Amino acid sequence: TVEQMMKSGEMIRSVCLGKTKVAEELVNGLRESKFADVKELKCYVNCVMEMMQTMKKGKLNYDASVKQIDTIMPDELAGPMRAALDICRTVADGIKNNCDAAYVLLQCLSKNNPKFIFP
Amino acid sequence: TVEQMMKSGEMIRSVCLGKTKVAEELVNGLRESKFADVKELKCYVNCVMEMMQTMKKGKLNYDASVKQIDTIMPDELAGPMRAALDICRTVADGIKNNCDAAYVLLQCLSKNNPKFIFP
């Protein structure tokens, strides 16, 4: 729902901000298709996906991801997010570095979701 | 840490869902402060607390819980949980039913912790 999405996103942001020592201005940039090749930012994205059960050890879990998407997001955002996850399902496969794998997946989702949003 | 909180949380959720036969929809309501008086849900909470060693025989173990919060939770989540634990330390004292005691503690923690999270 809207309220749950906001609560979850707010909590995940503060946890992953703290863990990855990323600059908050760079995190804000992720909603603006600014995707600089910054290690802390890549790892911030990986932390978010791990807290959402979407990636585990640098690999997408499709079923868990969809379960989380449906559980957290209102339909209006979930639907477009699932459709983008389908297009992007294999884009990060075989990328060894977890933070790099998560970032490649994020870039694809943003490129393929007209209603993209991220904590 | 993130990946251990996630692995641990996921396993413990799975075990306690199976044991208590609670509706997962009600378990999800816990994050929205919907503390329905449902036996399976109260016992789900107790199961999770026992698996995390925070309760034994329907009594809070304070030292073990402080340890547990500090070890499993990301610091950003640990602090607020510790403070809520102090405020709620005695709230379940005297309650004979184990599941009921676990639930009373959980409600108090949720009430006194802006950053509340639970498997």
Side-chain angles (χ1 to χ4, degrees), chain A, chain B residues 1-95 97-114 116-119:
Chain A
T1 60
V2 170
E3 210 130 71
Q4 182 61 11
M5 189 190 57
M6 299 302 295
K7 192 181 186 173
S8 292
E10 294 172 17
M11 179 261 262
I12 285 163
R13 170 183 287 218
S14 71
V15 168
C16 291
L17 267 181
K19 171 194 173 133
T20 61
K21 302 174 58 167
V22 67
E24 187 157 25
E25 27 287 302
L26 293 183
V27 169
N28 288 336
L30 298 169
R31 305 154 177 255
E32 303 170 29
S33 326
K34 305 232 281 195
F35 299 108
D37 178 11
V38 176
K39 184 178 73 191
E40 294 93 329
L41 187 60
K42 297 189 288 176
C43 286
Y44 171 81
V45 166
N46 182 63
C47 181
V48 173
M49 302 188 162
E50 285 172 350
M51 293 273 298
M52 294 284 292
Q53 310 186 226
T54 288
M55 284 213 155
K56 187 186 130 69
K57 302 186 193 192
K59 300 171 182 313
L60 171 76
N61 181 333
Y62 177 87
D63 292 336
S65 189
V66 164
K67 198 166 175 284
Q68 282 292 100
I69 290 165
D70 300 345
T71 301
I72 296 273
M73 311 193 93
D75 287 327
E76 286 73 23
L77 290 175
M81 194 70 72
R82 292 190 308 263
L85 183 62
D86 290 340
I87 288 168
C88 296
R89 182 171 179 162
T90 68
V91 67
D93 290 336
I95 294 175
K96 204 183 330 98
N97 188 280
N98 300 352
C99 301
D100 289 349
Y103 212 52
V104 162
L105 175 57
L106 184 64
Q107 282 169 93
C108 184
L109 298 174
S110 180
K111 160 196 149 253
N112 286 277
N113 183 352
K115 302 209 189 311
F116 178 88
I117 182 169
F118 201 68
Chain B
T1 67
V2 173
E3 219 151 37
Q4 78 178 127
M5 182 180 68
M6 299 307 299
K7 190 176 183 194
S8 230
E10 291 168 10
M11 178 270 288
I12 288 175
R13 184 183 177 102
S14 184
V15 171
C16 292
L17 281 178
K19 159 174 178 173
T20 59
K21 290 81 180 173
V22 63
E24 192 168 0
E25 300 82 9
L26 299 182
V27 165
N28 287 337
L30 291 167
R31 292 170 199 231
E32 324 192 35
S33 295
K34 298 193 204 318
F35 298 109
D37 194 356
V38 170
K39 191 179 174 175
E40 290 89 337
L41 180 59
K42 303 192 270 176
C43 292
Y44 171 80
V45 170
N46 183 62
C47 182
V48 167
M49 281 180 182
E50 289 182 337
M51 291 281 290
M52 296 282 297
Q53 311 174 224
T54 58
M55 286 193 73
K56 160 145 45 134
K57 273 199 171 179
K59 287 176 213 167
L60 172 72
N61 179 331
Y62 181 80
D63 293 329
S65 297
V66 173
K67 185 156 168 188
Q68 280 298 69
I69 291 162
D70 284 347
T71 282
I72 180 174
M73 292 187 100
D75 177 72
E76 5 269 323
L77 287 185
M81 195 68 82
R82 268 198 321 273
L85 180 69
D86 287 332
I87 303 170
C88 304
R89 185 163 172 174
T90 76
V91 68
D93 289 354
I95 305 180
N97 184 282
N98 292 175
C99 303
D100 284 4
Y103 211 51
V104 165
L105 174 62
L106 172 65
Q107 287 174 79
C108 185
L109 291 173
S110 187
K111 169 187 180 285
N112 292 272
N113 180 7
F116 178 81
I117 185 191
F118 193 78

